[PDB]
């Protein structure tokens, strides 16, 4: 399979992947329309518009082709949908438990207009980087440190606010590295400044989990034209530490939502020729799956009476419509305080996270 699916093709390929699994598993919908009216196709995969939200299943999204000429993400997301469906039909136990315990959202192309304006063989050493209105989708989200001109960004924002995404990663091009959030800094210096989060180590762990499984990223050296041998230790990096980006989407995802997002630069050739795409799939498949599995780390549970805020780390998260909460954490002891307005709180301390599956706890307020 080596073909760049364009408009229409996208929907056809996504629905072919949906039919490539059991019925009732996949739902392909649109979170909005681009400037030219191209739908923003999103495929939802889970056992059982977007349909009802299943209990005990964290929401995971992977928004690719967010820059128009960074299109390895688009094809690897399409192949990820196809592989998930094929594994679910074939009885792939790993993918079976993944789909049973995770509500995976895949967004192959956030900027279809820019993808259409992209030209084959352009490695990016404009080429459709912006939407058809000329605005960058990565420089349009509200910076923590006009929506009408970016309908794709507004649609993504509404989709995020309508859900309770736990783990996510947007996939990019032009390098091979996993950059974790706070993509900018208050000083807004070009490079060099380290901008850590309250969950800096958790984001480091997620970036490590993706990078170590990537054949190129695990080396920590993209070794690509116009890079000055910019060696990223461990294959991971911080946002402002790599280069300044004002209004990045992962920063909004972290600050304005419960989402934990890491930008994944899969390849340094932005629009590789079709022949290489197969290789790109084998370069990313496992890592992608790995990232989804990493949603099952930390603490998970429900808050029930006998939108509750969970506090650990100056980053609080809220519960879902079912009261479920998922806080991504690494092994160790944490002090979880649950606070609901009008419900006098509960500080359950000594919550111990073990490596692998997330720790369970049910709160009665």
């Amino acid at each position: 399979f080596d073909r760049y699916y364009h408009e229409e093709e996208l929907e056809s390929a996504l629905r072919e992947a949906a039919a490539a699994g059991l019925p009732g598993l996949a739902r392909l919908f649109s979170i909005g329309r681009s400037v030219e009216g191209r739908p923003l196709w999103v495929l939802r995969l889970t056992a059982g518009a977007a349909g009802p939200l299943l209990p005990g299943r964290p929401q995971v999204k992977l928004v690719g082709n967010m820059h128009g000429d960074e299109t390895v993400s688009r094809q690897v997301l399409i192949y990820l949908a196809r592989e998930l469906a094929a594994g679910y039909r074939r009885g792939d136990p790993r993918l079976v438990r993944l789909l049973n315990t995770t509500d995976v959202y895949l967004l192959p192309s956030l900027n279809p207009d820019g993808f259409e304006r992209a030209r084959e063989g352009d490695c990016g050493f404009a080429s459709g980087r912006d939407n058809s209105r000329g605005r960058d989708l990565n420089r349009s989200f509200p910076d923590q440190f006009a929506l009408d001109e970016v309908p794709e960004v507004r649609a993504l924002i509404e989709w995020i606010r309508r859900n309770k995404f736990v783990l996510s990663g947007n996939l990019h091009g032009g390098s091979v590295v996993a950059s974790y959030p706070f993509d900018d800094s208050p000083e807004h210096k070009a490079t060099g400044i380290y901008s850590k989060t309250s969950d800096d180590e958790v984001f480091k762990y997620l970036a490590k989990a993706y990078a170590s499984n990537h054949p190129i990223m695990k080396t920590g050296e993209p070794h690509c034209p116009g890079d000055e041998d910019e060696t990223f230790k461990d294959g991971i990096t911080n946002g402002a530490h790599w280069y300044d980006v004002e209004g990045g989407m992962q920063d909004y995802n972290y600050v304005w939502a419960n989402c934990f997002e890491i930008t994944l630069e899969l390849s340094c050739c932005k629009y590789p020729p079709a022949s290489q795409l197969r290789q790109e799939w084998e370069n990313n498949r496992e890592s992608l799956i790995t990232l989804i599995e990493k949603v099952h780390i930390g603490v998970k549970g429900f808050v029930k009476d006998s939108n509750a805020t969970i506090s650990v780390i100056n980053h609080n998260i809220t519960t879902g419509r079912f009261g479920d909460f998922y806080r991504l954490l690494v092994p160790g002891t944490y002090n979880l305080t649950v606070v609901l307005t009008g419900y006098m709180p509960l500080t359950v301390t000594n919550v111990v996270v073990k490596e692998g599956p997330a720790t369970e706890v049910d709160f009665s307020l």
């Binding site: 073909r3 760049y4 699916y5 364009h6 408009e7 093709e9 259409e116 304006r117 992209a118 030209r119 084959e120 058809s132």
Partner: protein, 391 residues
């Protein structure tokens, strides 16, 4: 051997010397052709001409080595044929054979250096408008002319055309005529999965209307889309005779005239069918329309003979160039020296304009130069519309 360009005042005299060797007839005669621009202009000279002039036109040529000075022979030039003087002076070219279509014209019936003087011809617009035809108004002052803006609360409402309702303002001119062309993407996957090169081609009854009337290649942010047969497509060096790959050819882009001319792939506009609406795909000449001609290129034809018909409308060649009632006569070591009258630009624009420049970054071989094996190549078709004017 005279081969150089002398720039004197508003004139440029370019001389070039080269070494040389349906029903109709094929004569044994060979004909001399120098109807391509690169036969006279070096890429440096073409850059110098197009970066500093709002127009140019030939004045007179001198050709030294019979000629059909009365044009009694079928004028075969101007059909964009091969056999032209090579762009590279060191190249030795073979004289193309002379043949015509139909009337037997025996060439030795004619009696066998010379100088020809070009008739007064309009300057070629070596500029692209900095204003759009629908944006000639003042973006600060409303119009005193009202337009019907409302029809139901069923009622009748009129509004003054202003900066916000800019598309509703009354206007004095219309875009050029349209003869709609089928749209083809350079991104191949975006096209239909059928061979519609001929079946869906825009043709006149069934000769193909290639390249048709001068219309913009694409609108904004659509450089991948081009009219199916509405643009000039030049051949890259050592391109295939037929069935050439897209990377083996160079497509010209006429979007510089998108500010006055309609897009070649899109309709001219909407009229009233009866409240049904009809879409006009082909639009003839209307009062008040203005349109730019097709751009000339360093590789493109220079002139073409206007057919000796009873009438014509805007007799400018559809391939670009200068429409001449009496073009340079057919000529049945060679030095051709042509003089061009330049139109010097007088622009008060503050910001710098767009000039043609060679890419700074490293290249394996210099563009518009010879490669390792001594083969001269033109890497891209250099346009002529780089400076800017106002409508």
């Amino acid at each position: 051997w005279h081969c150089d360009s002398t720039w004197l005042g508003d004139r440029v005299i370019t001389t070039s010397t080269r070494t040389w060797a349906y029903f109709g007839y094929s004569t044994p005669w060979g004909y001399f052709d120098f109807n391509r621009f690169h036969c006279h202009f070096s890429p440096r000279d073409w850059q110098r001409l197009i970066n500093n002039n709002w127009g140019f036109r030939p004045k007179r040529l001198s050709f030294k080595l019979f000629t059909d000075s009365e044009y009694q022979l079928p004028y075969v030039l101007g059909s964009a044929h091969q056999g032209c003087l090579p762009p590279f002076p060191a190249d030795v070219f073979m004289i193309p054979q002379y043949g015509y279509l139909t009337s037997f014209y025996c060439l030795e019936y004619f009696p066998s250096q010379f100088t020809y003087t070009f008739e007064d011809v309009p300057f070629h617009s070596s500029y692209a408008h900095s204003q759009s035809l629908d944006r000639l108004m003042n973006p600060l002052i409303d119009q005193y002319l009202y337009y019907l803006s409302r029809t139901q609360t069923q009622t009748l409402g009129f509004s003054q055309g202003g900066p916000n309702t800019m598309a509703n303002q009354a206007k004095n001119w219309l875009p050029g005529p349209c003869y709609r062309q089928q749209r083809v993407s350079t991104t191949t996957g975006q096209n239909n999965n059928s061979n519609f090169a001929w079946t869906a081609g825009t043709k006149y009854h069934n000769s193909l209307a290639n390249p048709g009337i001068a219309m913009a290649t694409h609108k904004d942010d659509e450089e991948r889309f081009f009219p199916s047969n509405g643009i000039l497509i030049f051949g890259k060096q050592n391109a295939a005779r037929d069935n050439a790959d897209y990377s083996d050819v160079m497509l010209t882009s006429e979007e510089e005239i998108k500010t006055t001319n309609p897009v070649a792939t899109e309709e001219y506009g909407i009229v009233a069918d009866n409240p049904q609406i009809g879409t006009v795909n082909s639009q003839g000449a209307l009062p008040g329309m203005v349109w730019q001609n097709r751009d000339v290129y360093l590789q493109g034809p220079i002139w073409a003979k206007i057919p000796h018909t009873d009438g014509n409308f805007h007799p400018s060649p559809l391939m670009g160039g200068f429409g001449l009632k009496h073009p340079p006569p057919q000529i049945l070591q060679v030095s051709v020296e042509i003089e061009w009258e330049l139109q010097k630009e007088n622009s008060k624009r503050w910001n710098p304009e767009i000039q043609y420049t060679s890419n700074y970054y490293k290249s394996t071989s210099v563009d518009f130069a010879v490669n390792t094996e001594g083969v001269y190549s033109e890497p891209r078709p250099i346009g002529t519309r780089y400076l800017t004017r106002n409508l």
